[PDB]
Amino acid sequence: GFPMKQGVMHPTRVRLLLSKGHSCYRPRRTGERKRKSVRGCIVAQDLSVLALSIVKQGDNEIEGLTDTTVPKRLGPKRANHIRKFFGLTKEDDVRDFVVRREVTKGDKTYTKAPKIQRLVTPQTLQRKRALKAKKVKNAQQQRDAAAEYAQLLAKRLHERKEERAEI
Amino acid sequence: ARGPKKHLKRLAAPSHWMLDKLSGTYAPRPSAGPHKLRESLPLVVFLRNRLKYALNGREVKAIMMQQHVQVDGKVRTDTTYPAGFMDVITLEATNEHFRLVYDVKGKFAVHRISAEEAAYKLGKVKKVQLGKKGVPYVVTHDGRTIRYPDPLIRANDTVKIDLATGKIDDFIKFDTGRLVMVTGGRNLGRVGVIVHREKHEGGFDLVHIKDALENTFVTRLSNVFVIGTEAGKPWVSLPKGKGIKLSISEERDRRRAQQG
Amino acid sequence: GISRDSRHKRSATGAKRAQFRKKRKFELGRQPANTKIGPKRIHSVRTRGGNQKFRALRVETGNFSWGSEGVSRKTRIAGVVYHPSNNELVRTNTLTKSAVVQIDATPFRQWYENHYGATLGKKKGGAHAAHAAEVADAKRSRKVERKLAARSGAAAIESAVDSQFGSGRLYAVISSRPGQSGRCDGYILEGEELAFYLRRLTA
Amino acid sequence: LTVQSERAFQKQPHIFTNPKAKANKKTKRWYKDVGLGFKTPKAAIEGSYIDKKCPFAGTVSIRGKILTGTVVSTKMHRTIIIRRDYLHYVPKYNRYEKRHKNVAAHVSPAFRVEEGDVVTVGQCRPISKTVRFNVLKVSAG
RNA sequence: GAUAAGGGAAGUCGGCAAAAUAGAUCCGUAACUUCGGGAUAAGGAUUGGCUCUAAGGAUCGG
RNA sequence: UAUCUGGUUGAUCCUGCCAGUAGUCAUAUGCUUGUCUCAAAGAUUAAGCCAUGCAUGUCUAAGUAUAAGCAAUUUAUACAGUGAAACUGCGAAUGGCUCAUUAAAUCAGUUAUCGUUUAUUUGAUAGUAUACUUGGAUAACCGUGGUAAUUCUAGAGCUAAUACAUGCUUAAAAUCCCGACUGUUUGGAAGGGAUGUAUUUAUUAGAUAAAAAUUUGAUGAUUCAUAAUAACUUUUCGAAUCGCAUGGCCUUGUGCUGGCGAUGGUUCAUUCAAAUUUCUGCCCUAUCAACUUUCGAUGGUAGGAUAGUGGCCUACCAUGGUUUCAACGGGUAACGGGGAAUAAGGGUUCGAUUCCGGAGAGGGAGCCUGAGAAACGGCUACC
RNA sequence: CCCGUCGCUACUACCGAUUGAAUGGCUUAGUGAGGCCUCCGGAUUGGUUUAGGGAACCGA
């Protein structure tokens, strides 16, 4: 039952220190590594199963693989994924082409539609306006504060000039 | 040991909190913030043990989640916020304002203040130096930094901070004759006047002080806090007692004068 | 791993100490970089506080300063000629701080020729003197002629530095810490420091 | 006692002497005032020795404890060990016993020390395995 | 006169015979002792080739 | 309460111990045991071994929902409520337990960081010389499964972001450099480059002895803060994020504007902390008198390494360092202190254990992750 | 009154062939697991992107 792993140049089992990212291991804690037994990538007679993917269909069909189809489970959800799925240009309202699966409950059947990410609304533009407005306003207040400090420094400087010119 | 501590044993809590011995194993550990863990007063203590408004900590969290409590004009949702010296506590729903000021006994007494005085706070200047872009700033005793301070403000001076804007209203120079309050040591809470500042380079600066009743008492410069320009004229309201120390016989006599 | 604790040492009296705890992570050390001259290869190290160091494994070029002229250029390290700590570092061409190196003098030559309108090296070579004479008189406007004329006087450099420019390789000392910052920077050797290192090199 | 007696050139870091400005052909020398009422010895200001561990012509600061003691060895290079005699009180017998400590201290070339001398040392950062103190004043003995 | 898997004196009156050790440099070396020894005790490490570097001199000339 | 009594003789006065007497936040044990309050409790020997169950998880209106989940027909055919799973974030370094190791070590009181790192909190803090908003994976889910067995997981098919990786939206002038031409006794210029903050290096500011032949912060103290010039960089970051309300302006354009918050992010300060650190102070032992320096011992110079100082390590050099004022070695049925009992005074003895500090997780060692661990209710190896 | 040897019994410790035995610590020498750094390497993989079919060419 030990899985085959890419890169292990062996027809036999090896023992590897697996970390985040390696196949055949799902880490349970951040930074955790385990040493696990895996099977090499070279196919030999000691294998219980051999996973295969059809690359080309030659002359005949197959009982439940080549003669049938299964639909995809979900459709696009990000805005530009929908646009590239239907070839839509950057003018069409993406909201009215969203796939909507049908859910039944007794008789009050209805549709479930994916929420779209990265979709521009008045709220998003409102936030983009607000951030820049805050930056500019902040710069104005900082310039005012520096100007006031300069005026205070100048007043002290000149009153000091005349105060030491009295003595 | 491997990282920061998060609990506080009850017997290890500061002695000015007046915590009973037997209520439980632990005491509220004040959060990180504007005041030292040992010299602060967590809000749960102030609203449960002092004001007696809340009966228990869970009620303190019920109170503070509804924006009721403010410190220095800002709503705090931290049950263990490190409120300290001069901090203004405001309870809007009861329309009631407080300032944490030491009493002569060495405790954060419960001091009701008016709404007009609950609009600023004093602050002792710890250091001044230039920041980024050549901008000078001062640091107060509550970790507040103020940019563009008056060219004359130096260490140990006190600035009058406007709570709404965080700006400096006016400041008091540290010199002989200043009304001060002692913020550490044996003489915690006692109000006096500066008589002589004694300097020791590399070591510790001592400050001779005198009460309204002429008793002279010396204290480390680090424990002094300038609170007024001259005798009898502070810039904040004083606790009931005026910061004056009484002998044990005197307090016995006054207790038997108001209860017998 | 490598530990920087002092508890593993003997006492100042010579006494042997007993172990007090296991090794701590806050007292670790790491392997030396041993930076060589070669195509750039810089590795990153995550350090205490989540900070980040860069370990120069190989570097080609560096930022070098001409102190008496107030200009710094990015030039090419040619090799190591002297190292006070260990001559094996010279032998293997290991770049650390304080190593004495030769760098390409080209960018500094361009700067000086453009700035003072003169030449460096004093080598009347066959094809060298052609370049020198051409640099002497070029296509050049009049206000720039005057600014160069004002810049003369402060145009001659010391003889020891000048004599090197005929080779295109100037002596220099590394000032950065390549194993730490990931960079190999330095300054041109001049003055009695240059005289001292020339005396050492001639042996 | 030539300054340049090492593999590496002895220099004060970041004190640049320009070989091009004009005459006064001597290297500029940096020094500081240690404070706490100690005077900079003349050999520090007009001297030529390079010592990064010197309190006056070096990068180490004086802060912390100030000690005094008798010099008992000058057999290391630029380092001495001084003896600090004292009296320990034993309460049970209402009496004292004689005790001593040996302290290793850096000695700058600006001073001259011989065995049998009393010196004042100020505390600096660790500058050796055993050295945490640095000579600031030498009294002939 | 040689070699021999695994074992290693079970052979034999008996380790007979044979094997094992072996030069030099460095390290380390017990009981006991007539204080001289025991001692190469015991027992460890090193060793080629090539290209270099350093130290150890003689006679002249103030 | 500053106290004694019995015992050697036929009898006596002594020395001298034995015995008596009282206490123990001092243990065990025997007998006995009605009531209320309070309250220690597998330390001692075995830091011996452990069946089994539990002891660390966590979602707000404000990161990611097409659950083939429940509910609503209501403000809604892009989603909108409630709500498993899973991705993301944080915590899991606190706590609790124990006393094995440990004798200048721990620890106590005092110092130092002008010798450093610091999540978070709290203050400040950035206009920098495709944009009505970029990509393409992947989990959950469906389906095919392999192993006796594990909190094992593999093919294959979809699909998100505050995950991953990229990327513009910006002021006004002024300053420095090169400088085609040109005016010509030293000037005007076209045309180019550089301006923020991070990194690295070099070089300049960062001031102050009083009479004839020009202004600058802090410190006891600095090469401090800060500013400037020249460049440098596998170019740090100066918001492609979320929830509520949605108002105002008319040159009505799906225009321009803008309120309260969430989460972010650079630097400094602050707070919570760490790491090193000065001075002085430990029980018994000489049937331990010399110890350390081969292979760092003491110091010097340069480097490497570290968050940073330092023989911490390396290279070269010198021959130093401790000791009868007891080093070094050995023992401890030794974790240290706050404290406890006794107590005229002076002392004697106890302190594993309610608090503080240290150390460990069967024994060693090595690490990942992370601000923080040499973590063990984390990993790796050996016994 | 009293001394020592001798006889019976009991207890404690000492010496002692056994190159005796065990437990704990330190350690020379030889072997040496596993991390970490480093050096190549290159199952696989996306395109620094360009190929009339893809042909030169980059990143993980």
TrEMBL record, chain A:
Q: Which domain of life is it from?
A: Eukaryota
State a single Gene Ontology molecular function. metal ion binding
Which residues does the annotation say bind Mg(2+)? 117
Instruction: List the GO biological process terms.
Output: translation
Please give the GO cellular component terms listed in this UniProt entry: ribonucleoprotein complex; ribosome
Q: Which UniProt keywords apply?
A: Metal-binding, Ribonucleoprotein, Ribosomal protein
The similarity comment for this entry is: Belongs to the eukaryotic ribosomal protein eS6 family.
Q: What is the protein name given in its UniProt record?
A: 40S ribosomal protein S6
Source species of the chain:
Candida albicans (Yeast)
Complete-protein stretch covered: 60 to 226 of 236
UniProtKB/TrEMBL annotation, chain C:
Record key words, sorted: Metal-binding, Ribonucleoprotein, Ribosomal protein
The GO annotation for biological process reads:
translation
Write down the superkingdom of origin.
Eukaryota
CC annotations in GO: ribonucleoprotein complex; ribosome
UniProt xrefs under InterPro entries:
Ribosomal_eS8 (IPR001047), Ribosomal_eS8_CS (IPR018283), Ribosomal_protein_eS8_euk (IPR042563), Ribosomal_Se8/biogenesis_NSA2 (IPR022309)
- NCBIfam families for the chain: eS8 (TIGR00307)
Q: What is this protein called?
A: 40S ribosomal protein S8
